[PDB]
């Protein structure tokens, strides 16, 4: 079972870094062919996903084709555009080109840092929201404030102040409020971009159907179906009806859930457990597919045009490896960092 024994100070240190690695973020290329994984140590790996899914595939094809140090602190969030890869690291966002990150140069385009309260902590950036219909980017983190940045020029337009503690996740549903934000304070807030005000607040811990005071009050994940909402984290995995703010159904699971998303007609979830949780919208546990990590922090559906062969579900968390699901009942393989 111990196949590779390191036998050397550098290789023992590399085995210790791989053993203590956490993969926070995932991003996909504009084509389906590449994957990007953010690191505990501020590194970024680039995964040739089409080469991994090919018929000709080697054991060294499940390795980063380009990995590079990109931030001083951990990479908590990535997002991708038509041409760029935006990565939020220590307290600032860097931008990378997909054409140049495969080459030997690996230079950055810009480096933008939002204005702060000048406290001596240099707060994090937990969630990156890429807004269509206008070239914009929403920053959220330990400043407890939502910053809006233009993508063309590095100017910060709106600052939104509704939360008490820091923010974990953002959302988008293309209507009049159009922006959800959930945080450590325990309330999902709605942020109309035109008036730059808060229009609705849903406190999930106040409702006794959802409370669970043992884990605490923190909202880790949000999801939108433009009429519905899935809110999870500390309290419970709950299905809310927007414009009513009523808890419709509860998903009966013990472990706290760090990420949630809408599938075609399923609910995908992952958290402190080992497995990926597939729910039905009524509230019935359809499946639990075991992964290779003891806990998961990120899911990604690679639903991109011009590459139908790169249509997989990728999962990552408290490990140095990424589980790739070519089908939703079993893992096909795993990409080492």
């Amino acid at each position: 079972v111990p196949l590779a024994v390191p036998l050397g100070q550098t290789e023992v240190f590399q085995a210790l870094q791989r053993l203590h690695m956490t993969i926070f973020s995932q991003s996909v290329s504009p084509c389906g062919k590449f994957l990007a994984a953010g690191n505990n140590y501020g590194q970024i790996a680039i995964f040739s996903l089409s080469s991994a899914l090919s018929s000709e595939a080697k054991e060294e094809s499940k390795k980063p084709v380009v990995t590079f140090q990109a931030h001083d602190g951990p990479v908590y969030s990535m997002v991708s555009t038509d041409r760029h890869l935006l990565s939020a690291g220590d307290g600032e966002v860097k931008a990378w080109l997909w054409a140049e990150m495969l080459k030997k140069g690996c230079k950055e385009l810009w480096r933008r840092q939002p204005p702060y309260r000048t406290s001596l902590e240099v707060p994090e950036i937990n969630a990156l929201l890429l807004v269509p219909k206008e070239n914009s980017l929403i920053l959220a983190g330990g400043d407890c404030q939502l910053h809006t940045m233009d993508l063309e020029t590095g100017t910060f337009t709106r600052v939104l102040r509704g939360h008490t503690d820091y923010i974990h996740c953002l959302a988008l549903r293309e209507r009049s409020p159009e922006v959800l934000s959930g945080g450590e304070d325990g309330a999902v807030r709605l942020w109309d971009l035109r008036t730059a005000k808060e229009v609705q607040t849903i406190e999930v811990y106040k409702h006794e159907e959802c409370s669970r005071p043992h884990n605490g009050r923190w909202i880790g994940c949000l999801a939108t179906d433009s009429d519905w909402m899935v809110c999870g984290g500390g309290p419970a995995l709950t299905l809310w009806h927007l414009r009513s703010s009523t808890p419709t159904t509860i998903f009966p699971i013990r472990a706290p859930q760090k990420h949630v998303t809408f599938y075609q007609d399923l609910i995908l979830s992952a958290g402190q457990g080992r497995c990926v949780n597939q729910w039905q919208l009524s509230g019935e546990l359809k499946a639990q597919v075991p992964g290779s990590s003891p806990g998961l922090l990120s899911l990604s559906l690679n639903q991109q045009p011009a590459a139908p062969e790169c249509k997989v579900l990728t999962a990552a968390g408290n490990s140095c490896r990424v589980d790739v699901f070519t089908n939703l009942g079993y893992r096909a393989f795993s990409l080492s960092f």
Partner: protein, 41 residues
């Protein structure tokens, strides 16, 4: 392919506020959802 009261239409369309009336639905799916949450409220 296996799956598991009402309001008059003009009364629903003329009594509900335009936040709950959802004039963009004038799809049957969002129309029935507007009927359901109007009955709930």
């Amino acid at each position: 392919l296996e799956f598991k009261d009402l309001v008059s239409l003009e009364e629903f369309y003329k009594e509900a506020p335009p936040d709950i009336s959802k004039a963009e639905v004038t799809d049957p799916h969002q129309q029935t959802l507007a009927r359901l949450d109007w009955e709930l409220e």
